[PDB]
Amino acid sequence: LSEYAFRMSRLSARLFGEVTRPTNSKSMKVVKLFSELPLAKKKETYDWYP
Amino acid sequence: TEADMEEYIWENSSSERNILETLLQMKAAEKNMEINKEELLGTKEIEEYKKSVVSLKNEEENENSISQYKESVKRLLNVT
Amino acid sequence: SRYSPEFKDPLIDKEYYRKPVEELTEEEKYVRELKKTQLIKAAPAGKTSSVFEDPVISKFTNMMMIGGNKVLARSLMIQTLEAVKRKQFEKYHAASAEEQATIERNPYTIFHQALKNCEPMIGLVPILKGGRFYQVPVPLPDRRRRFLAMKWMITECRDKKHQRTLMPEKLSHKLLEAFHNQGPVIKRKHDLHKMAEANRALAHYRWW
Amino acid sequence: RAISRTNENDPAKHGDQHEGQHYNISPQDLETVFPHGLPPRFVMQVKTFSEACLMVRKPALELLHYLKNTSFAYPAIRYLLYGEKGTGKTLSLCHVIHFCAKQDWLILHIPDAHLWVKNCRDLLQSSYNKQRFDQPLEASTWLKNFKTTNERFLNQIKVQEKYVWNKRESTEKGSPLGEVVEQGITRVRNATDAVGIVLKELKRQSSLGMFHLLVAVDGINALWGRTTLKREDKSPIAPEELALVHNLRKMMKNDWHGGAIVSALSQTGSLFKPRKAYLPQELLGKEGFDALDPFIPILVSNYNPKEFESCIQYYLENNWLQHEKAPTEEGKKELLFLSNANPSLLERHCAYL
Ligand SMILES: */O=C1/[N]C([N])=N(*)C2=C1N=[C]N2[C]1O[C]([C]OP([O])(=O)OP([O])([O])=O)[C]([O])[C@@]1(*)[O]
């Protein structure tokens, strides 16, 4: 793997909707806590009890 | 990076350099000094070798592919 | 489970099916059988119809096996058979002419003679009477004697040993000692016979 | 009744009429031509019979018809004897080495390339062979047995280049190579310097007609296969990081004349290879496919009945099949069934039966 792959991955990141510059998996924690919902707001959690 | 190339193009390929050094060493062995690699390309043996390495590197390895490889290198190396 | 009543036992003898047309008792038996041609038990994965197989070696295999490694028991039985064959042939290479003609090279009949050496003949039972346990001599059934000999060879191969020597050489040297009437399983057999001699006045305590 | 042992030890006299022949080799001859490398499960056969009796395998003879007429003008010519596992790939190289010592060639025998890769525990670096890690112990395995392969032609070599040995010693000029290979076998710190300087000196004198050099290397899939030996911070290396074997890879590049190198692909310790891969490109890899230096692939096949019937009928004069009903005809067809006319799986049965 070299920059041929790095540039293909970067342009498919600008294409398909991922982040183009590389980052840590600890910083991908924020994109997976932002690509879904918080725990409290789900219709089967705060409305567990009617 | 040629890792992303899929087919075996004979242009500046490594086994091409091996059979090319083989043609230079063989034409020195015969002491007949007609050293033109572009004339050495014109033989039937090296292009049967070229089709055999192309077929062997793209199509995965079967017995009859090795029969074709053996036939090419056998008429190539002056072996009976 | 999951077998049922009337299900029959396996048959292996091919030549028995080749020419059964000579008698009348078993002839009418297999007339009665094929007239029914019942739901038989399926043939197990341990036995075959071949002529290169032996029942006693497969039993000593299965009595040698720990758990579910039929492959390791197969490797041990194969290695010990070949090693004892090559020890007898290496003694053949260091033999004279009559020593060529008197040393046996088949490991199979040597092994079966070794088991017949290994076989206990008079047994024990703990019987309680007058509050004490008394060791009584009892004659044994045949399957008991042969089972005891096979497990005796197994366990004295296993644990009465050094941690240095590997198992197929170990079992080969054990069979070699058991083949010549001087192995330690024979000495244990002699102690068993000696103590069944020693408690000879207890043989009226058996009720059968 | 198979024609087995009337043909004596003569690899220069194997015809196609001579088929299925258990040719007897004298055991002193194996002290000369094969103490270096042999399969480990084959040593049981010889010391039990005192008959080094190799049956005529038709590809084992067929490579010799390419060694009568391979000219010494032509360079180092590769040959591979591959096939299914157990067909005697490592045993089909054994048929040609006995010819080349009968024709007085230079036997660069390598026992097993897998042991050069795996299972070597103690590790040194280098300074004279350009700063790479190397095994002095595997050099110590090779340098002792190599001399007694060929002893007539190793001392006739003149070392025509002044090599530096230590800060106390060097090398003397025009010396017999029988000195130079074993001059530092005592000083094992640079006994791995005794391989790459020395075998490249045998490259130069191979060009003339006094010496006929042939690489005899077994299992070349490990020479271009990625190794398992690790470094101190748990980093694996390349096969191009071993200075013991890095100069060994210089040899299969046809850079000398006068001989015809033979190699045999093996399947004992093919690391990171599936067991069901048995072909050359499937085992050597991509680095074993570009640097091929065009080689002739010899597909070692399975038996015909002519090699099958020769086998058990040989074991009958030796009284080897000790079973009662084993020489019956159908008892041959089950060994023909369970061993599928493969040589190595038949000997496993004829080990114990
Ligand atoms: O003439 C013979 N040719 C070959 N190939 N093998 C052979 C011959 N006589 C006896 N043998 C037996 O072959 C077995 C060794 O096989 P091996 O070790 O080379 O298998 P691999 O996997 O490497 O190809 C052995 O029993 C030997 O006695």
Q: What SS3 string covers chain C?
A: CCCCCCCCCCCCCHHHHHCCCCCCHHHHHHHHHHHHCCCCCCCCCCCCCCCCCCHHHHHHHHHHCCCCCHHHHHHHHHHHHHHHHHHHHHHHHCCCHHHHHHCCCCHHHHHHHHHHHCCCCEEEEEEEECCEEEEEEEECCHHHHHHHHHHHHHHHHHCCCCCCCCHHHHHHHHHHHHHCCCCHHHHHHHHHHHHHHHCHHHCCCCCC
Cβ atoms D116, D228 nearer than 8 A: no
State the pairing for strand pair D106-110/D79-83: unpaired
Cβ atoms D161, D198 nearer than 8 A: no
Tell whether residue D87 is among the known ligand binding residues: yes
- Whether chain A lies against chain D with 3 or more Cβ pairs closer than 8 A is no
For residue D103, give the DSSP letter: T
Residue D250 to residue D215: CA distance in whole angstroms: 11
Q: Which of B21, B57, B61 sits opposite D279 (nearest CB)?
A: B61
Centre a 10 Å sphere on the Cβ of residue D44 and count the other Cβ atoms it contains: 14
Nearest CA to ligand 1 atom 14: D344
- Whether chain A lies against chain C with 3 or more Cβ pairs closer than 8 A is no
Q: Which helix (H) or strand (E) holds D53?
A: strand D52-54
Residue C120 to residue C186: CA distance in whole angstroms: 9
Centre a 10 Å sphere on the Cβ of residue D80 and count the other Cβ atoms it contains: 21
Closest ligand 1 atom to residue D83 Cα is 24
CA atoms within 13 A on the CB side of C88: 26
Cα C88 vs. chain centroid, distance in angstroms? 21
Q: Give the resolution value in Å.
A: 3.5
In one-letter notation, the amino acid at residue D85 is K
- How close is the nearest chain D Cα to the Cα of B41, in Å? 15
Closest residue in B to A6 (Cα) is: B1
CA atoms within 13 A on the CB side of B71: 11
Residue C74 contacts by C-beta under 8 Å, 6 or more apart in sequence?
C61
Whether the CA torsion D220, D224, D226, D227 is positive or negative: it is positive
Q: Which of D316, D275, D298 is nearest to D86 (CA)?
A: D275
Closest ligand 1 atom to residue D89 Cα is 24
Of D84, D114, D270, D344, the one to substitute when testing ligand 1's pocket (max ligand atoms within 8 A of C-beta) is: D344
Residue D319 is encoded by which pair of tokens? 């009284």
Residue C119 is encoded by which pair of tokens? 């076989």
Residue C140 to residue C162: CA distance in whole angstroms: 33
Q: Which of C108, C129, C147, B30 is nearest to D353 (CA)?
A: C108
- How close is the nearest chain C Cα to the Cα of D211, in Å? 42
Contact at CB, C89 and D328, closer than 8 angstroms = no
D237: left (phi over 0), alpha (psi -120 to 50) or beta: beta
Tell whether residue D44 is among the known ligand binding residues: no
Closest residue in B to A4 (Cα) is: B1
Q: Which of B19, B66, B76 sits opposite D297 (nearest CB)?
A: B66
Q: Which helix (H) or strand (E) holds D213?
A: strand D213-218
Contact at CB, B79 and D290, closer than 8 angstroms = no
Residue C182 to residue C202: CA distance in whole angstroms: 30
Touching subunits of D (3+ CB pairs, under 8 Å) are: B, C
The owner of tokens 């590997």 is C166
Cα separations in angstroms, C78 against C60, D96, D98: 12, 33, 33
DSSP string, D7-29: S-S-TTS--SSS-S--EEE-HHH
Cβ atoms D137, D120 nearer than 8 A: yes
Residue D5 in 3-state DSSP? Answer: coil
Q: Which helix (H) or strand (E) holds D52?
A: strand D52-54
Enumerate residues lining ligand 1, CB below 6 A.
D 39, 41-42, 45, 54-55, 57, 85-92, 266-267, 343-344, 347
Nearest 5°: the CA angle C85, C90, C94 is: 145
Residue D332 to residue D339: CA distance in whole angstroms: 10
Tell me how far the alpha carbon of residue D3 lies from the centroid of ligand 1, in angstroms.
19
- How close is the nearest chain C Cα to the Cα of D124, in Å? 32
- Helix ranges restricted to H, chain B: 14-29, 37-40, 44-58, 63-76
Which candidate in B1, B2, B6 is best for mutational testing of the A interface (most A CBs within 10 A)? Answer: B1
Which residues on D lie below 8 Å from B77 (Cβ)? 74, 77, 294, 296
Contact at CB, C52 and D351, closer than 8 angstroms = no
Could you tell me where the beta strands, DSSP code E, fall in D97-211? 106-110
Nearest CA to ligand 1 atom 25: D42
Nearest CA to ligand 1 atom 9: D54
Tell whether residue D268 is among the known ligand binding residues: no
Residue D82 to residue D265: CA distance in whole angstroms: 5
Tell whether residue D90 is among the known ligand binding residues: yes
Phi and psi angles of residue D289, each rounded to the nearest 5 degrees, phi first:
-120, -35
Cβ atoms D336, D301 nearer than 8 A: no
Contact at CB, D75 and B29, closer than 8 angstroms = yes
Phi and psi angles of residue D53, each rounded to the nearest 5 degrees, phi first:
-105, 95
- How close is the nearest chain B Cα to the Cα of A10, in Å? 16
Whether the CA torsion D211, D216, D220, D224 is positive or negative: it is negative
Cβ atoms D153, D106 nearer than 8 A: yes
Residue D48 touches chain C, beta carbons under 8 Å: yes
Q: Which of D322, D317, D308, D309 is nearest to D350 (CA)?
A: D322
State the pairing for strand pair D213-218/D106-110: parallel
Tell me how far the alpha carbon of residue D298 lies from the centroid of ligand 1, in angstroms.
16
Which residues on A lie below 8 Å from B2 (Cβ)? none
The owner of tokens 């499960």 is D41
Q: Which of C129, C110, C120, C130 is nearest to C191 (CA)?
A: C120
Tell whether residue D83 is among the known ligand binding residues: yes
Whether the CA torsion D60, D65, D71, D77 is positive or negative: it is negative
Nearest 5°: the CA angle D186, D189, D194 is: 70
Centre a 10 Å sphere on the Cβ of residue A15 and count the other Cβ atoms it contains: 9
Q: Which of C203, C42, C162, C55 is nearest to C115 (CA)?
A: C55
CB pairs under 8 A between B and D: 67
Q: Which of D228, D136, D146, D232 is nearest to D187 (CA)?
A: D136
Tell whether residue D89 is among the known ligand binding residues: yes
Which residues on D lie below 8 Å from C107 (Cβ)? 322, 352
Tell me how far the alpha carbon of residue D38 lies from the centroid of ligand 1, in angstroms.
10
Residue C202 to residue C200: CA distance in whole angstroms: 5
Which residues on D lie below 8 Å from B74 (Cβ)? 296
Touching subunits of B (3+ CB pairs, under 8 Å) are: A, D
Tell whether residue D171 is among the known ligand binding residues: no
Contact at CB, B18 and D257, closer than 8 angstroms = no
Burial D247-256 (b: 16+ CB within 10 A, else e): bbbebbbbbb
